[PDB]
Amino acid sequence: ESADLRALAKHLYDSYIKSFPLTKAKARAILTGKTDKSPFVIYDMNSLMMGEDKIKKEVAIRIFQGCQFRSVEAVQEITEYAKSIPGFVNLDLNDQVTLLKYGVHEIIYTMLASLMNKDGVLISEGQGFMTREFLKSLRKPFGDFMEPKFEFAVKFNALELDDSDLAIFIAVIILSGDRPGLLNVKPIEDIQDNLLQALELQLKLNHPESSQLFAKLLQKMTDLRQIVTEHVQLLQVIKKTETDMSLHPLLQEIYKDLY
C-alpha cells in the first residue's frame, strides 16, 4: 500500500529533523542569503584566528582535530537516527553495530554535501564558513583530504534533494544487506526493500518532473564507497607521518577492519 509508504516516509523525516541539529534547508538558507543567519567566513589564517571571538598547535592539525570532533558528533546523531528506523533496533546487536560502522562514513559524506557549495563547508553548526581553497592550502598530507568530498558534493547537489528525500535515502544506506560479517541478511534486506519502496514513492511525488531520479540517486552510492576507500588510505598515512596525533576511539573502531 502506497499510504503505508507515505506514513513511513513521514516517520523517517520526523526522526531526521529531531536527530540532526543542522538540516539542508537551514544550511542552504544560510548559504543562499535568505541577515542573522549569515556566517563568518575563514579564507586565511587571520580569518581563522579572528573566528574564535565571533564563534564558539599546528593550524592544519587544529583543523583536523576539529573535523574529528565533528565526525564523532555526526556518528552520535546518525546513531540516534538509526534507532528511529523501524526494525533496526530489533535486529541482532552485532548486526546493528556492523551496519552502523559501514553506514556512518557514507552517511556523513552525504550529509556533508548539504552544507557544501563549490566554495565551502559550513562549520560550527552553520555559524562559520570555511573556504575550499583554504582547506586545500593546508600542508601535506593534510591539504588533499577535503577535496574528494567537494567533488561529490557538487555532483550530488545537482540532484537537489530535499531533507525528506535525504532521510529515506540514508535509512537505505544504513540498512544494507551487503555489509561484511553480517550474521543475518534476510531480516535486513526486507527492511531495505521497504525503505527503497518509500524512496521510490517519495522521489516520484517530490520530483515528478525529474526522470529516473531514484536510479540516479542509487548510482551515487558507488561514488560514496569510492570516497570511503580514499579516506581510509589518507587516514592511515596521517597516523604514520604524525605519530604525535591521537585518534578518537569511536572513529578508530569504525575505520578498523574495513573491507
Ligand SMILES: *[C@H](/C=C\C/C=C\C/C=C\C/C=C\CCC(=O)O)CC(=O)C/C=C\CC
Ligand atoms: C572533516 C569534518 C568537517 C569538515 C568541515 C570543516 C572543517 C572541520 C572542522 C572545523 C570546525 C568545526 C566544523 C564542524 C562543526 O563544529 O559543526 C571531514 C571528515 O569527515 C574527517 C573525518 C575524519 C578525520 C579525523
